[PDB]
From a paper:
To gain more information regarding the dynamics of the OMF tunnelling mechanism, we focused our interest on OprN, the OMF protein associated with the MexEF complex within P. aeruginosa. This efflux pump is implicated in the resistance to fluoroquinolones, the most used antibiotic class.
Although OprN has only a moderate degree of homology with OprM (31.4%), its structure was solved by Molecular Replacement with OprM X-ray structure. In addition, an equatorial domain called the buoy domain, mainly composed of α-helices and flexible loops is located in the middle of the α-domain. Surprisingly, this buoy domain is the main structural feature that differs among the OMFs proteins, both in structure and sequence.
Numbering used by the authors:
A (entry chain A), B (entry chain B): 1 to 445
C (entry chain C): 1 to 451
Write the structure that this text describes.
Amino acid sequence: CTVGPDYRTPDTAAAKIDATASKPYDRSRFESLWWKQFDDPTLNQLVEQSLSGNRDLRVAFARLRAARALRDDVANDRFPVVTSRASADIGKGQQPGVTEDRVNSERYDLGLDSAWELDLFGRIRRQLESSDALSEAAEADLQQLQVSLIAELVDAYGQLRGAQLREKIALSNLENQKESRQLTEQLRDAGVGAELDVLRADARLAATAASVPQLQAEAERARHRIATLLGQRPEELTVDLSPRDLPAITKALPIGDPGELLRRRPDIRAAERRLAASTADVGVATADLFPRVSLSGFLGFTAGRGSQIGSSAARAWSVGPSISWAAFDLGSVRARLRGAKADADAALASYEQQVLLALEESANAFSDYGKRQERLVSLVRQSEASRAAAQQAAIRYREGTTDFLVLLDAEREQLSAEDAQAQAEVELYRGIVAIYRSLGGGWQP
Amino acid sequence: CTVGPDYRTPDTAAAKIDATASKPYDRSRFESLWWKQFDDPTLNQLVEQSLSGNRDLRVAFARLRAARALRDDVANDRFPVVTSRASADIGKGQQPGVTEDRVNSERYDLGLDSAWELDLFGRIRRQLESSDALSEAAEADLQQLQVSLIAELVDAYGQLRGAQLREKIALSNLENQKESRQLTEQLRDAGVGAELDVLRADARLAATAASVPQLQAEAERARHRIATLLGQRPEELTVDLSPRDLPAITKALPIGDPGELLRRRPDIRAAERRLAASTADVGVATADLFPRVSLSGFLGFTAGRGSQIGSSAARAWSVGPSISWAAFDLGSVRARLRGAKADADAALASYEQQVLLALEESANAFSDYGKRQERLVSLVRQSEASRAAAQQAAIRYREGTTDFLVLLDAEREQLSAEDAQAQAEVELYRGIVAIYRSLGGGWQP
Amino acid sequence: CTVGPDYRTPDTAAAKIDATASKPYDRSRFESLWWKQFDDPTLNQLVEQSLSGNRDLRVAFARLRAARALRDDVANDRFPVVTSRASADIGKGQQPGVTEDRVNSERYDLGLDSAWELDLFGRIRRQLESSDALSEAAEADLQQLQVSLIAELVDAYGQLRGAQLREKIALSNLENQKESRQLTEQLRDAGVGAELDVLRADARLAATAASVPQLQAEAERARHRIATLLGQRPEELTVDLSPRDLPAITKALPIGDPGELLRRRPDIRAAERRLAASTADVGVATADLFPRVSLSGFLGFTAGRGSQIGSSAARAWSVGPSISWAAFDLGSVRARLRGAKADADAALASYEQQVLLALEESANAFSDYGKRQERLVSLVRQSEASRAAAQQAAIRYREGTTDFLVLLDAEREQLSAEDAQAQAEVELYRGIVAIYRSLGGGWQPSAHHHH
Ligand SMILES: CCCCCCCCO[C@@H]1O[C@H](CO)[C@@H](O)[C@H](O)[C@H]1O
Ligand SMILES: CCCCCCCCO[C@@H]1O[C@H](CO)[C@@H](O)[C@H](O)[C@H]1O
Ligand SMILES: CCCCCCCCO[C@@H]1O[C@H](CO)[C@@H](O)[C@H](O)[C@H]1O
Ligand SMILES: [Cl-]
Ligand code: NA
């Protein structure tokens, strides 16, 4: 008898994402070490350091150890608990029933105490089933944290490279705008120009120069996130983060069969294990509806005179079988069973919410990424056309055939176009991170 | 007797919102089913389905069931607790007081055990007062969750419509700009234009084209959000969410008396019930300064020989009145009572914080909504003037009385004004959501 | 004897912020009342009201009271627990090993019951040590809340002044825009202008006018945050928030020595205290490897007849010494010890995480502050050049020597540059707030002899 419900994993349908039978994706294989596809040795080294150094990941390993330990304690309860004891009871007073004289009472005991719950309705088995499930939930929390940390770290490296790239674009445009300002001064100083042109050229220059330390500020915050993610102090970063291009993936993304994502994601597995544990805890409570059968025991020495402890004349053994049942207090037991039942329903609903959220995340990740590819195509044209316009406009302002606002406006748009394209490239990179995060890549899978 | 403080609900003054005596608002009625004023049957359907499907709401129902179960367990402690038992003590050794010969010894017992706490100072009455209040707190948490879920979902629908409206504005402006690009080519080719016009028109068209998939991406995210809020997978959502106009409310908003808002909001009642519970708990702890009167009992059979259990010559009864009092351990009792007073002071301050947060949310929503109405008036005027500007610039550019930049800039401003007016209409719809969430609209009794 | 590990504070190296040996910072002093340097008596009153009224600070202080009361209860376990009792056992049945007759049975007891765990391996001393350290983690949680709340309140005052500043600038740019609209109309009606000029000037006015109620909305939301942070209802604010300038500190920033920052941060002390409690808890579990020794007792009266209770004839006493040891259940004691040790690893690891997060907030605050100063320099220039361009473009438009677009564009850049400058001024103010928050400003570390 192991009473209560026997847990079965819910019959959860595979994820279905149609968007993935398309050019951008390769369903034939899944890459577990998904970040290496960027081909960036600096990134690969950040990730390896993270996995040895991160303090959140280290808390999660410790919690996994703690959970195993809880389990190990509970598993002993299937066996008699045999402890040691030496005690005495000594006093003087009446002894009602026997005498109204005040007489000396002495008693000495030395030996083994035994306590055993016979697990006839599986109360104890259910407890262990529960702790086993909680131990596996802790393993899966640890794996999720790994998935989460790697995505966060790869993502922050993206933001660093982005700030760097945008800084480079700001300073490149700042030189075009300085050339323009210098031309407005030259034409003004040769008597064929205007202060108005110079003032507008100064203002635009100053706007562009203002963007530079803001972008450097962002890059620094990203260096500092990266250091914390690595388990390192900000000034102690080992890995060199001097600018390099934003990484890129050429090939179609190896995403495997999107219908395996719910099986691969550890957060799903962790919530499924919590549901398993909770379901076993209904069994624990269900056992209290039935009688409890216990078996106490003593083996050693009992004596009225302390001097005899240890001798054959004081040998003693005792056995204490006991059956308890709640009887008229079954109402209380039923209340606790309803408690355990409500908690298992909370756990199932919570499991289902995790599934739903996981499907929401992957549906977003794939929807975003398709759309971000399309957007980038339009941004690349915008940048090419902008540049060509700003070049033509600079020529014509020099030659006297267009007003300064034509060159100013064309310069503003070139900056705006180039910067927007960079941001869109960063988004694509981060969209890749989001896809692999939502698929549960990076724990070993 | 019932020791400790008698709980009284704090005398919290009514919310006062002076800005509600304006024209935007109707204080003569409150609509509970506040979203139905949008007259959007698709919205109505979404809300009804989320009330049966949402999984966070299912979790809260189950938490309520858990709390009622704790309360039911406590309620039985008012009465003698009567369990059943069959035990035996079997052994061989000395029997101190009686003999030093190692003898066989047997005791059998079978019957009913009684444990009764007389509760003369109302310790148990107070325990039940606390558990009852907490069941009510769990019921209020459930209702605050409905309020928050319905606001979240109405708001997401708004965002979905917003992105659909903005995609529509972007595509409409994309056509105007495509007509402009074709005009620059045509005039260039006919010999009265310039490559510099065409390049610039190419860049702006691409910029507008680029916005379209970003808007579409956002529409897809809001759709996936709605699906999870309904308790559905993204691909199972059957509700037809193809574009419709952003809903609007043309009559003054029925907001009722804003002095009722603190009584309506379930968050406030949940924090009030937690306060009532912690106050009962002070009662529990205060009761331990006084003696505890109890009464134990046995009714059944007691025998020296297993043979006799069940027979008349083994009938036994037993009664154990007991009075205990902490005496020199009152330091420990006083320490717990201080603990309980501190907890009740936390719960009081936390209730006041919730009140002040509710008034803040409420003050923001009204202040926001008034300003978003005024702001929209100016944006409507901006959009009108801009369309007329763009219209005229296009006539003037075709005719040869203005330069391409004038037309380019007027089209930029048209898009920018139109898009901004759209975002402001979306803000207004969300302003209405914020108002009703802040008044505690939309929960079931 | 006290068993298990003896806690030593980690040897945590000092923070090193190279960037702070610079002209913007004065490392010779630290002001713990860091907001007073803005020399803004309105702000100073907000802060004092907040400290009297804020409800979250009351919650945290009440949690600290409860933690100390818990610690006081655990402290009593080092001594005999002596309770009092009056009782009886009355019945009818057999009495095994005595008679098989159903006899009447009566018994009365009255006196003191005593229970004592003799704390020979320090189980109870370690419990008290854990519970004291958790007390301390609660004083420090409260102190970290106060640092956070002060920073949040000062930051919100800044946003409020920001929003008032930007509304002033929008309104001022609106007046220039209206003068320009008037001119497009005159030039039109005098046969030397264009309807297209009037139309674009109207679109621009409406755009600028649109921004005003949004800035007012922002300012209202800041007033309302301020009120909740003071423990006040939104319409009952006691401090007048009518527009004033965003405060400034011209003096170089008194930041002390950056290698003192980890000692000044209460969030660090809290996490360190939880690590100390958790290490004590290893001790608690270690003590269960060893025997437990107890002494029970009774002193009072025992009798078979009720009337005799209280008299000499019925005096009574007993003593009940005891020693147990887990023996064959040692594997359980060991599982719990492995568990306690795992929890201590977890705590050391959170303590270190908190240190790293504290160094990241500090690095970011100093980094941002420096960059924000540089940026403001360029934005001040933008504003100066834009204002002058717009003045000139107006002269030129009036002359018949530009399309209106030259003026319209110069007026947008003037508003856009001034507004950006005001935003950057707000961001510098908020950067100051982020520096002080990261350094653990806003509480008194020297109080209570530190510990
Ligand atoms: C009237 C005299 C009776 C004589 C009885 C002798 C009791 C011996 O006494 C016992 O001796 C043992 C070693 O032999 C010890 O281990 C015991 O602890 C001790 O109490
Ligand atoms: C077991 C014998 C019964 C002893 C009962 C003594 C009754 C105690 O009496 C109570 O003691 C408290 C002292 O802290 C006070 O707060 C109460 O006001 C007082 O009435
Ligand atoms: C660990 C021993 C606990 C001592 C109780 C101290 C009670 C008050 O604690 C004080 O609260 C203030 C805010 O209310 C903080 O500014 C102080 O730094 C803090 O010590
Ligand atoms: Cl982190
Ligand atoms: Na009960």
